[PDB]
Design a protein around this ligand. Sequence first.
Ligand SMILES: NC(=O)C1=CN([C@@H]2O[C@H](COP(=O)(O)OP(=O)(O)OC[C@H]3O[C@@H](n4cnc5c(N)ncnc54)[C@H](OP(=O)(O)O)[C@@H]3O)[C@@H](O)[C@H]2O)C=CC1
Ligand SMILES: NC(=O)C1=CN([C@@H]2O[C@H](COP(=O)(O)OP(=O)(O)OC[C@H]3O[C@@H](n4cnc5c(N)ncnc54)[C@H](OP(=O)(O)O)[C@@H]3O)[C@@H](O)[C@H]2O)C=CC1
Lengths: 231, 231
Amino acid sequence: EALSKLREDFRMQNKSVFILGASGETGRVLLKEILEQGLFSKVTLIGRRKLTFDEEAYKNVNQEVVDFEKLDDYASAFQGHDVGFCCLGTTRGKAGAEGFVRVDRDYVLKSAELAKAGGCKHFNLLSSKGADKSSNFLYLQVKGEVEAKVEELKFDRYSVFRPGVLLCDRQESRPGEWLVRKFFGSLPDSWASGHSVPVVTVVRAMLNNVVRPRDKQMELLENKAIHDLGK
Amino acid sequence: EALSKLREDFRMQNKSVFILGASGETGRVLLKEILEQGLFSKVTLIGRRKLTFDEEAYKNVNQEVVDFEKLDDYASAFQGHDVGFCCLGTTRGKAGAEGFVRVDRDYVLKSAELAKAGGCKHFNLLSSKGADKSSNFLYLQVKGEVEAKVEELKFDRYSVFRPGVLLCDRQESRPGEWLVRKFFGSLPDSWASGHSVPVVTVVRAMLNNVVRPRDKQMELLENKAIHDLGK
Ligand SMILES: NC(=O)C1=CN([C@@H]2O[C@H](COP(=O)(O)OP(=O)(O)OC[C@H]3O[C@@H](n4cnc5c(N)ncnc54)[C@H](OP(=O)(O)O)[C@@H]3O)[C@@H](O)[C@H]2O)C=CC1
Ligand SMILES: NC(=O)C1=CN([C@@H]2O[C@H](COP(=O)(O)OP(=O)(O)OC[C@H]3O[C@@H](n4cnc5c(N)ncnc54)[C@H](OP(=O)(O)O)[C@@H]3O)[C@@H](O)[C@H]2O)C=CC1
């Protein structure tokens, strides 16, 4: 109800959004929810390849195909958007150690830099629970490092999300949750919420947050807060 | 290619199929793949509630809404199908201990009994890795018990599938796999396949198996075999 009011006010602001990582599993859910909620008057995807869609609402989605190795040459793709969401990410297994840093730190930071120069007022970064630039684990070290480097850009509003392992298709209430929980010991039915979170809940938290009036310059939501806001 | 030949031969046999648990996550993927592959000339869902669908192919799907507490009164719903798939299942958290036994053992066994009496020649049961009727863990004890009780019905062909924890949306190649694997230690990139499996792979294994000519009266596929056959 109050949230409904915030969404209406937000739609009246005629805001545009750009998304990095829309082809990914979190990104595709974010795009779908953005279209289902009709929060933005213009939606632009920025990525390495053109995507093909099903439903009709996708017909109005703009796509900017870029070469991340020469991103500066595609600076125009980052011009004029009010809000940005970054769901890009790879793994060491798929890209090697250096390739992982290249995507999760370099491409993300460069994109953020171009977005700031392009007028973006609210940048949203999908990070991970445990992000720590001092970590000895490459994945968490890089997440902590890129969080800090994007903070330095000083967006009017910067939101960092640190979800636990991403679930899908109600895994949290299906038999697999019982099997995993039992493997770890005699635990309470709410144990899973501490280390995991459904991707739809993460997206709902991101969009419920986007319609709240800007307050603090930097917001960082840990897994519990994501569960609470993504209700 | 050889598999393509088996599928063609199977379609020429004009077989009908019934599915229990089509509303579930594995069941819905099984139904979708059955329609996409066009393996059966008649598809019937048996369950506690009527389901509503999207795509056109679902228009020919028959639905039998039954009361599992009085299943004998719905014996006609099990009449005449050649193949049956059971993807029913609940949890202790959702149904309590007795309620879990009621669904996973009682409803499943009763359904199998009615299917056998109804002429079903090939019954497929979705069980779990670790199923053991002697287990001290309720979930695995019940899975092991119902596997044995259905074996006693002596279907012409009985296939039991024991998948590890069910994944979805490429979780096996996304960052969550790296996080979970690292939590467990320094492990090889193929570690996850030993304890988990994508639901689509499970369904593909089930359907690749269904088109193979009957050989042994009972077949039991463990997680590795499911990964291999569900390629
Ligand atoms: N999955 C999980 O459990 C968790 C994930 N995270 C974080 O959330 C974010 C999203 O994760 P998730 O949705 O699972 O990721 P996915 O693997 O589903 O999506 C990854 C995205 O990044 C893009 N990408 C990857 N490599 C490149 C590249 N070399 N060049 C250009 N684009 C690239 C992909 O594009 P393309 O389709 O072209 O490859 C895709 O859009 C990541 O930053 C991840 O670290 C946080 C907590 C847990
Ligand atoms: N998820 C996992 O990781 C694993 C699952 N398994 C096994 O695979 C099977 C399928 O699992 P999964 O797809 O995740 O399950 P889901 O929870 O997605 O689906 C469960 C199904 O059982 C039906 N069901 C549950 N309770 C009742 C009831 N009281 N009366 C009638 N129908 C009921 C559901 O119907 P409705 O929609 O009406 O509730 C639904 O069709 C289960 O037997 C599970 O134990 C095996 C290995 C791991």
